[PDB]
Design a protein around this nucleic acid. Structure first.
Ligand SMILES: [K+]
Ligand SMILES: [K+]
Ligand SMILES: [K+]
Ligand SMILES: [K+]
Ligand SMILES: [K+]
Ligand SMILES: [Mg+2]
Ligand SMILES: [Mg+2]
Ligand SMILES: [Mg+2]
Ligand SMILES: [Mg+2]
Ligand SMILES: [Mg+2]
Ligand SMILES: [Mg+2]
Ligand SMILES: [Mg+2]
Ligand SMILES: [Mg+2]
Ligand SMILES: [Mg+2]
Ligand SMILES: [Mg+2]
Ligand SMILES: [Mg+2]
Ligand SMILES: [Mg+2]
Ligand SMILES: [Mg+2]
Ligand SMILES: [Mg+2]
Ligand SMILES: [Mg+2]
Ligand SMILES: [Mg+2]
Ligand SMILES: [Mg+2]
Ligand SMILES: [Mg+2]
Ligand SMILES: [Mg+2]
Ligand SMILES: [Mg+2]
Ligand SMILES: [Mg+2]
Ligand SMILES: [Mg+2]
Ligand SMILES: [Mg+2]
Ligand SMILES: [Mg+2]
Ligand SMILES: [Mg+2]
Ligand SMILES: [Mg+2]
Ligand SMILES: [Mg+2]
Ligand SMILES: [Mg+2]
Ligand SMILES: [Mg+2]
Ligand SMILES: [Mg+2]
Ligand SMILES: [Mg+2]
Ligand SMILES: [Mg+2]
Ligand SMILES: [Mg+2]
Ligand SMILES: [Mg+2]
Ligand SMILES: [Mg+2]
Ligand SMILES: [Mg+2]
Ligand SMILES: [Mg+2]
Ligand SMILES: [Mg+2]
Ligand SMILES: [Mg+2]
Ligand SMILES: [Mg+2]
Ligand SMILES: [Mg+2]
Ligand SMILES: [Mg+2]
Ligand SMILES: [Mg+2]
Ligand SMILES: [Mg+2]
Ligand SMILES: [Mg+2]
Ligand SMILES: [Mg+2]
Ligand SMILES: [Mg+2]
Ligand SMILES: [Mg+2]
Ligand SMILES: [Mg+2]
Ligand SMILES: [Mg+2]
Ligand SMILES: [Mg+2]
Ligand SMILES: [Mg+2]
Ligand SMILES: [Mg+2]
Ligand SMILES: [Mg+2]
Ligand SMILES: [Mg+2]
Ligand SMILES: [Mg+2]
Ligand SMILES: [Mg+2]
Ligand SMILES: [Mg+2]
Ligand SMILES: [Mg+2]
Ligand SMILES: [Mg+2]
Ligand SMILES: [Mg+2]
Ligand SMILES: [Mg+2]
Ligand SMILES: [Mg+2]
Ligand SMILES: [Mg+2]
Ligand SMILES: [Mg+2]
Ligand SMILES: [Mg+2]
Ligand SMILES: [Mg+2]
Ligand SMILES: [Mg+2]
Ligand SMILES: [Mg+2]
Ligand SMILES: [Mg+2]
Ligand SMILES: [Mg+2]
Ligand SMILES: [Mg+2]
Ligand SMILES: [Mg+2]
Ligand SMILES: [Mg+2]
Ligand SMILES: [Mg+2]
Ligand SMILES: [Mg+2]
Ligand SMILES: [Mg+2]
Ligand SMILES: [Mg+2]
Ligand SMILES: [Mg+2]
Ligand SMILES: [Mg+2]
Ligand SMILES: [Mg+2]
Ligand SMILES: [Mg+2]
Ligand SMILES: [Mg+2]
Ligand SMILES: [Mg+2]
Ligand SMILES: [Mg+2]
Ligand SMILES: [Mg+2]
Ligand SMILES: [Mg+2]
Ligand SMILES: [Mg+2]
Ligand SMILES: [Mg+2]
Ligand SMILES: [Mg+2]
Ligand SMILES: [Mg+2]
Ligand SMILES: [Mg+2]
Ligand SMILES: [Mg+2]
Ligand SMILES: [Mg+2]
Ligand SMILES: [Mg+2]
Ligand SMILES: [Mg+2]
Ligand SMILES: [Zn+2]
Ligand SMILES: [Zn+2]
Lengths: 50, 252, 109, 84
RNA sequence: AUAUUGGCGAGAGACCGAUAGCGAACAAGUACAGUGAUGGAAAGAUGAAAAGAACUUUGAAAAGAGAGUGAAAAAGUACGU
RNA sequence: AUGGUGAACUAUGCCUGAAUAGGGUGAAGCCAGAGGAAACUCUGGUGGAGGCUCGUAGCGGUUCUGACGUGCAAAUCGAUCGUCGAAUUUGGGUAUAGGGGCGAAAGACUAAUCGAACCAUCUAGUAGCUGGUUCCUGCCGAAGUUUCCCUCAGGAUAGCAG
RNA sequence: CGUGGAGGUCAGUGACGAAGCCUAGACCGUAAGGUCGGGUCGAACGGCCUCUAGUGCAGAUCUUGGUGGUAGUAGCAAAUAUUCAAAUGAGAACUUUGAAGACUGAAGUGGGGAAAGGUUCCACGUCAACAGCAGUUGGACGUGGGUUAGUCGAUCCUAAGAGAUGGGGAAGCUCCGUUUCAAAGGCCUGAUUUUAUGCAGGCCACCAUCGAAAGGGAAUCCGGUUAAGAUUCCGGAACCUGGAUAUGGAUUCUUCACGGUAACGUAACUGAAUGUGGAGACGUCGGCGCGAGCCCUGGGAGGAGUUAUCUUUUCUUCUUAACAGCUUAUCACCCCGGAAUUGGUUUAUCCGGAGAUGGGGUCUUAUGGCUGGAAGAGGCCAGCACCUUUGCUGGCUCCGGUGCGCUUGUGACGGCCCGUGAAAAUCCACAGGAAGGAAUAGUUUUCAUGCCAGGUCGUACUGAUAACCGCAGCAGGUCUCCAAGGUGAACAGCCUCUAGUUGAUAGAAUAAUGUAGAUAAGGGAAGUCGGCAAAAUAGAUCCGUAACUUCGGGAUAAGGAUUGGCUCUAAGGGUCGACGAUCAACUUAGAACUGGUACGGACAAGGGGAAUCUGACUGUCUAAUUAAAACAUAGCAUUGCGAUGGUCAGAAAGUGAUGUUGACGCAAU
RNA sequence: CUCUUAAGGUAGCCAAAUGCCUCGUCAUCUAAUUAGUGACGCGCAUGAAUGGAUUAACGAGAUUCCCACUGUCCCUAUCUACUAUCUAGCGAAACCACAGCCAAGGGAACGGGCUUGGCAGAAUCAGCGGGGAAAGAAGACCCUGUUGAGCUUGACUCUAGU
RNA sequence: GCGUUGGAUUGUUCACCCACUAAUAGGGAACGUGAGCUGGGUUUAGACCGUCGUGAGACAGGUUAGUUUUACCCUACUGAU
RNA sequence: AAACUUUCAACAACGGAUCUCUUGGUUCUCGCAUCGAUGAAGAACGCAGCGAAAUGCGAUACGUAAUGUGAAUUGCAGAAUUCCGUGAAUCAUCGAAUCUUUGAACGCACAUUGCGCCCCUUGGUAUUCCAGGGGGCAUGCCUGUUUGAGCGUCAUUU
């Protein structure tokens, strides 16, 4: 809203920091059934609902 | 099958009075030693409009008898009361318009306003614009005063109950046609959400006892017993009689 | 012509969001937010505006010398000159009437 | 109206984040969380809501003290040191 | 002595074998929907071992054709059958 | 049925804000003039009233029963329209919650849900009613009739069959 | 007969290939099925005797998943519109740049914001997916950068209201109530200074807290700066709050100032408790006055355009912030004076012996003027140097006019109400006179200067025909500020400037039938349920206007006439000294002339009348098939009720609504 | 003159948005009128705040006539844009027992199939609305159910309140 | 074989009258024909009246308002390869 | 005769059935009794050389201390190979600590990373203003302590 509470900004900061693809050195680990970031969010597809 | 409008009014959610603009409760002074034994002189500082009320209020400032300060009181202005006028309240105050006197201290035939029902309740009777109480007599033994109320009822009150000499100002107000739904709107906007009123006969049966039917009609007698219950008491509750009033009032 | 914008985040034409349009030394038009105008202090007896007393928003009176807020008279920046004169006359005359009432009561007995 | 045009007027949150559970179930006007019941002392739960109890019950977090209570019991709530 | 679809620790089964069995064998009460109470999935399998295809060639590239690894590429991660 | 969740839509009250070209008409009050014995009357100006009016922005939604009707759209689009300074329009805050609210009243509205919202549980609710009911071959092989039933799309009973 | 699993057995089959799967190949059985060969494959499985069951599918608008025909089909057609060239690139209708043509046309397709979103902002790389064509581009993908405050908000205040406590109710979750049936108190200080506290002198309490990013509110502006931040950064210049404070000034020998008749003036010019007052603090409309910005415009100093011809021409720059000093109003007030021959006076008729007009003064400082800030800034130019940082060097940035103009602020008024149009925090002042005060000196941080500090959170961007909601990049919905020229009554329509966009899949044809827009001889509603649809009318000026009427209307009734262009004519003003001089803007009326008799030339823009039914009217509702005669309404009538009450709430309450009420009221019809 | 009621519909008004008969009768309106209007009234079944009668003004209300006006029509024609069409790219859905030429017959009494005839030649494109008793939805009407729900009432049985 | 009409009133089918005409015959085709239209009527939900009903409500009684969806498939037909 | 349609086969597709697997579930049995104001369960936000999650943890942050084992961890990087050692480890064990903001949640509030008060201490002359560090201030109830109130009331002086 550009006049946001610190709580909202903090959740926004966490979302920005976790908005990234899978680290590519994962998928080299020994067993590693993890293929991709299945929790990837985008502002155009799914709303954070705060 | 539904809770009717007069039943919903009791919850007081949207039916509370719109009291934001009001000046305060209109009351006599607290019945104290000065008024019980002598009189106290205050001064009328303002005659002001009260929202939702027809009669104007008078802000009367008295000296505090026990602490150096002023005590402002909100009286209902009697007709003829003016700003800068000295108001006298007490057993020994003079029979002058605007003075507050015990009912026993005024002669028979006196016209008073804002009359206490009990001594010290600070005003209950004849408070609406143009209304007044008439002293019709005293009973000194078992000290009481018989008075005529605006409704025509005769009441016996303690001779220590106070009233204000004169008639409540603003009289004749209901003599002007409102002429307009808009004027009724603005009248009730400052009183309460009781307007406009849908006729119960224009509703459905679920909404009102009078609702339903292939024509709009009550269907049963609109005179409803006093012993009826909530949801039934729509129409003429406990009517002694109906029809155009022909003849004289004041039964014996 | 040059069109201006509000400078605070309030976008509504409220009483505390009044703007004038000033031309800057940069040669451009710009909105300038203007405070709400002050009301003249008024007599406590008659309600007229008090002569000689400065007209500021309430808290600005603390940032100003006593001269701006008072008048050199018996009721300063509280009551007007005519109201104070009326108070003088009423006090004097009513005290005299009180003395003569006391004398009348003492000599009617 | 009442469909697509009326959905355009949805910009005022009835609920915001709850301090206790973080679920965005704190009713702004009621000042009450519809999920955990904050600010009531008890945590809202119902036996008709078995799935919700399962969602929020003990063990759904890290348990942070209780995960070690069991080992401490097994060792008898000892207090000293292992004494090389 | 009795109870115990919770907790902790164990031993089992003529039980089910990834549309079954708990909703969830997997970053499952997750992703996602709803203002909210709540609702709530899908999704296991290269190969013994990545040895996960060096190198050449055509193509802007993706890729193709070869070459090669491998027991098998009629196993090429779009992977057992 | 029990226990919960909703007034971000909308209904209504309250609190606090905001918004509404340009025209027509020309009410009180006021000025001058004329007439009259008087009571008073008349004329011209001024003025700028009204839940007045034409008509923008608004707000609404008549008719085309137009467009679309696998839509731009689970209600829109175009023209034509009602209204447009107060019972006006609207933001935010706030209150009212399900046999409850709210209703200038249509059983309307109460989050695409209303002649009783939504959510979960009771609950795999009951169904004389509809649909389905999964391998082969061999042998035997019907009844729609009797009596009774709040029975007449059902059952019991006897009969027919194994 | 077949299937999953179980006991026994065949010391059964099997990596030299179990199971599974495929196989118009073979055999057995009436059949359910069984067996074999071949291919594929890779780790288990079978015959028989028994045991056991979640044991056999074609259906259940069956469940889950997958897949078709339809079918390269329906379609990708609203929002005027694109074109040329170059660059980039593998590839260009769509990217970039340039050129052109257009549009939004200031009630924007512009510039900002609130809610919401949450990184979408910006840069670099970059096109697998997404952008219903494309894509080298992107709100995409990958990696990073980015949001700077004492002064802008939140924070503080209270509003409707929410809600602890004390108490009461409730089995209870909890409910009521918000100052109440409460022992609800800290902040001041003589003394105590065994210590500025306890005892011990004395002054004030009908009470938590939450509730506004649009209400109230301490204080900041200009210029510059970034890829992206700016009232936050930088430069300069201010201000407020809290504190500390020392000088100067002021005051005091008549201690707590002088002046003015007065209104009041000032650099100050003591002032506790307590009280009082003011500000905060308030509706709406109308005309009038004034200011600011904008619009228009003259001269001049610059730059640009046109120049066959004309145009001393067309466009453009010429600016001045917060803050500070001096000065400046309407209103109001004071002194003199005493007014009828009543005068003054507004557009609007109010004012005067309760003292007018007049003469002279006082005041608020909205606001304007000058100066400082501040020309050093910003703007417009010119002349040089340039592998760069870029360097510079100069000049000018001036003086006016105008108004029913627009936007806005404001003042004095006027109209309106049975409507009279918040509260609190906070700040100030007064009354009072507690106390404290001077003479090799006391007093004064409301005068000046000087010193220190001002925390926390937000701050990017969009705000929508793509950043919100509507399943989406959806023709829907979603609050608000600013607002240029012309025509015109006009924020109408139409065209244009600044700014922005040129985005909607395209190319080629031009059948039917459509959707949207139009025209039509003669007739003129014969069509049709019905004039549905369409047409006709339309602006302004002048004339003329009926029935009926509640006398207000009806009414733009009806019905007519005129309207362009051009050249003139007349009338309506300001300032200054019966006139003279000077200056200025439009509105109205008329005349001649003129023309393919056109002229509200586009745009814009009533059809009218005679009646009947019905509802008085304005207003309201079935969001999404009904706008009506339905509802409401004012008016009328009836009913209940005098508070230990009427009506209505609550499970109960030491509980509520009406009620901050009182019969001219509330409640029910 | 009777029977008779609580009272017997008064003032008004009417084939009216209330009149069955009924397109009532008379008049007017027209060439022609189940329409409109004005009258009449033993009025199935008009009528007095369940308001009667009337009413200026107002009305996106219902209706009749007239003038104007017109493609509503006689009776159609033509033009423009965008589609449709063809192409490059992109690319769904409804629906689908199997499918798709008729006539008659019989048949669950209206066949695409069956019988008897007629016939019958690949693959197709644009249109079209006869048929597919086309699609959309377990008919909303009707009936049945010992299935409900909304609403009402001296139904049965209760209940808050009082 | 060939034609069998234009109108006033009414949703109307029917009827009735005006009028022209050679004549203004009767009928069928799912009482032909609504993915051909229209929607005046009937026949949802709004509303008014009359009679009936205590009432909610009823009325082959009257009155006013009231969303008419889809073809691109197969055949048939019209044209066209 | 092609094309086209249909049927079958082979190979290739589409799709993910079948078969075989199984650190999962389900049911039965046996044993045990241990959450929290010494702040629980739950929540938010952070923490790694390179992590978005799961898991672990709390500014001592995929952990510190202690004990045991005895040489790893591993995807890369780095370190180390003394590793015959108080010593690797994403080991096990776990008795000592840390334990942000919260939460019954406790100074008052909380749609605020809002607002106080007390003590010690540090800096800015500083008891008073501002700031930094540390430690505290909820309610009900119980026992006790201290200070009090009430002509409720006793005694003494009077
Ligand atoms: K009413
Ligand atoms: K009724
Ligand atoms: K002064
Ligand atoms: K409009
Ligand atoms: K129902
Ligand atoms: Mg009424
Ligand atoms: Mg109704
Ligand atoms: Mg009822
Ligand atoms: Mg009743
Ligand atoms: Mg009705
Ligand atoms: Mg002054
Ligand atoms: Mg709804
Ligand atoms: Mg809300
Ligand atoms: Mg599963
Ligand atoms: Mg697999
Ligand atoms: Mg193999
Ligand atoms: Mg709301
Ligand atoms: Mg109008
Ligand atoms: Mg529309
Ligand atoms: Mg339509
Ligand atoms: Mg269509
Ligand atoms: Mg109804
Ligand atoms: Mg069952
Ligand atoms: Mg047999
Ligand atoms: Mg029986
Ligand atoms: Mg049957
Ligand atoms: Mg089994
Ligand atoms: Mg094999
Ligand atoms: Mg086969
Ligand atoms: Mg294997
Ligand atoms: Mg089974
Ligand atoms: Mg099957
Ligand atoms: Mg079957
Ligand atoms: Mg099926
Ligand atoms: Mg399926
Ligand atoms: Mg196509
Ligand atoms: Mg289309
Ligand atoms: Mg277009
Ligand atoms: Mg370009
Ligand atoms: Mg345009
Ligand atoms: Mg344009
Ligand atoms: Mg960008
Ligand atoms: Mg594309
Ligand atoms: Mg592409
Ligand atoms: Mg990005
Ligand atoms: Mg501020
Ligand atoms: Mg409470
Ligand atoms: Mg607050
Ligand atoms: Mg504010
Ligand atoms: Mg910016
Ligand atoms: Mg600075
Ligand atoms: Mg002096
Ligand atoms: Mg004077
Ligand atoms: Mg100023
Ligand atoms: Mg404005
Ligand atoms: Mg910004
Ligand atoms: Mg922005
Ligand atoms: Mg914008
Ligand atoms: Mg969206
Ligand atoms: Mg003009
Ligand atoms: Mg014609
Ligand atoms: Mg013609
Ligand atoms: Mg004609
Ligand atoms: Mg006709
Ligand atoms: Mg006809
Ligand atoms: Mg007709
Ligand atoms: Mg029309
Ligand atoms: Mg006319
Ligand atoms: Mg007329
Ligand atoms: Mg009406
Ligand atoms: Mg009006
Ligand atoms: Mg509707
Ligand atoms: Mg409608
Ligand atoms: Mg009515
Ligand atoms: Mg009669
Ligand atoms: Mg009649
Ligand atoms: Mg008639
Ligand atoms: Mg006719
Ligand atoms: Mg009567
Ligand atoms: Mg009647
Ligand atoms: Mg109207
Ligand atoms: Mg046939
Ligand atoms: Mg037959
Ligand atoms: Mg068939
Ligand atoms: Mg045949
Ligand atoms: Mg053929
Ligand atoms: Mg068709
Ligand atoms: Mg057909
Ligand atoms: Mg059925
Ligand atoms: Mg059904
Ligand atoms: Mg039965
Ligand atoms: Mg029932
Ligand atoms: Mg038919
Ligand atoms: Mg048909
Ligand atoms: Mg149809
Ligand atoms: Mg038909
Ligand atoms: Mg109809
Ligand atoms: Mg109906
Ligand atoms: Mg009746
Ligand atoms: Mg019927
Ligand atoms: Mg902790
Ligand atoms: Zn005064
Ligand atoms: Zn919660």
């Amino acid at each position: 809203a550009a006049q946001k509470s610190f709580r909202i900004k903090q959740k926004m900061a966490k979302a920005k920091k976790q908005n990234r693809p899978l680290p590519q050195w994962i998928r080299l680990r020994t067993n590693n059934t993890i293929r991709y970031n299945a929790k990837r969010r985008n502002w155009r597809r799914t709303k954070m609902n705060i | 099958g539904r809770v009717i409008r007069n039943q919903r009014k009791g919850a007081g959610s949207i039916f509370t009075s719109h009291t934001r603009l009001r000046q305060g409760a209109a009351k006599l002074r607290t019945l104290d030693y000065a008024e019980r034994h002598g009189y106290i002189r205050g001064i009328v500082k303002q005659i002001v409009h009260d929202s939702g009320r027809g009669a104007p209020l008078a802000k009367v400032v008295f000296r505090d008898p026990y602490k150096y300060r002023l005590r402002e009181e909100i009286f209902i202005a009697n007709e003829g009361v003016h700003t800068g006028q000295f108001i006298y309240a007490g057993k020994k105050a003079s029979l002058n318009v605007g003075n507050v006197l015990p009912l026993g201290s005024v002669p028979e035939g006196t016209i008073v306003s804002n009359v206490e029902e009990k001594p010290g309740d600070r005003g209950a009777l004849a408070r609406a614009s143009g209304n007044y109480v008439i002293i019709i007599g005293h009973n000194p033994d078992e000290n009481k005063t018989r008075v005529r109320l605006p409704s025509g009822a005769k009441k016996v009150i303690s001779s220590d109950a106070r009233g204000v000499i004169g008639v409540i100002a603003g009289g004749g107000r209901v003599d002007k046609p409102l002429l307009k739904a808009g004027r009724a709107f603005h009248k009730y906007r400052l009183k309460r959400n009781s307007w406009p009123k849908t006729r119960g006969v224009a509703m459905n049966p679920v909404d009102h006892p009078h609702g339903g039917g292939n024509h709009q009609h009550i269907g049963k007698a609109s005179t409803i017993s006093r012993g009826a219950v909530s949801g039934q008491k729509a129409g003429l509750i406990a009517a002694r009689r109906t029809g155009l009033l022909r003849g004289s009032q004041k039964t014996q | 012509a040059q069109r201006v914008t509000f400078r605070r985040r309030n976008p509504y034409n409220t009483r505390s969001n009044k703007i004038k349009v000033v031309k800057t030394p940069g040669g451009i038009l710009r909105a300038q937010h203007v405070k709400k105008l002050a009301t003249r202090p008024k007599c406590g007896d008659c309600g007229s505006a008090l002569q000689g007393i400065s007209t500021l928003r309430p808290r600005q009176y603390a940032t100003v010398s006593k001269t701006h807020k008072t008048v050199s008279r018996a009721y300063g920046g509280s009551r007007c000159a005519n109201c104070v004169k009326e108070r003088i006359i009423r006090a004097f005359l009513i005290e005299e009437q009180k003395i003569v009432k006391k004398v009348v009561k003492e000599q009617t007995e | 109206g009442k469909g697509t045009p009326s959905f355009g007027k949805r910009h005022n949150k009835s609920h915001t984040l709850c301090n206790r559970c973080g679920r965005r179930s704190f009713h702004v006007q009621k000042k009450t969380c519809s999920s955990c019941g904050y600010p009531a002392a008890k945590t809202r739960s119902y036996n008709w809501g078995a799935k919700a109890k399962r969602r929020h019950t003990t063990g759904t977090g890290r348990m942070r003290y209780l995960k070690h209570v069991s080992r401490r019991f097994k060792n008898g709530f000892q207090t000293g040191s292992a004494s090389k």
